[PDB]
Amino acid sequence: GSVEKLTADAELQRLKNERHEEAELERLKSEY
């Protein structure tokens, strides 16, 4: 459908979740 789950709250969560993955990904990325 659209590039959104048709609700801001869901997009909010998704982007938050995205960033949250980023943090864990960054944490995995950063050894030293």
């Binding site: 801001a8 997009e11 909010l12 982007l15 938050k16 995205e18 980023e22 960054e26």
Partner: protein
């Protein structure tokens, strides 16, 4: 009387409409209306109701604490170390 915005977290801190633009580490926050350096989907046009403004530490998505994007190329986002109020 909202002139006194208060610099603690009330609720999730979504309603923190303070003008703190520096993060928990004191880094410079990236303006929500900017895509530099970090291209982000937090467009104030798509989340207008969240008062997503300037490079101020805001909480639109209901994170555990208000936060901000970092202007640091390495750091995508940063938390903002805001006090916590009882309510």
């Amino acid at each position: 009387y909202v002139e006194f915005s208060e610099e603690c977290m009330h609720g999730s801190g979504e309603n923190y409409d303070g003008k703190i633009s520096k993060t928990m580490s004191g880094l410079e926050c990236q303006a929500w209306d900017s895509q530099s350096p970090h291209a982000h989907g937090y467009i104030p046009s798509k989340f207008p109701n969240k008062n997503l403004k300037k490079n101020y530490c805001r909480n639109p998505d209901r994170d555990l604490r208000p936060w901000c994007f970092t202007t640091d190329p390495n750091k995508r986002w940063e938390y903002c170390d805001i006090p916590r109020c009882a309510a």
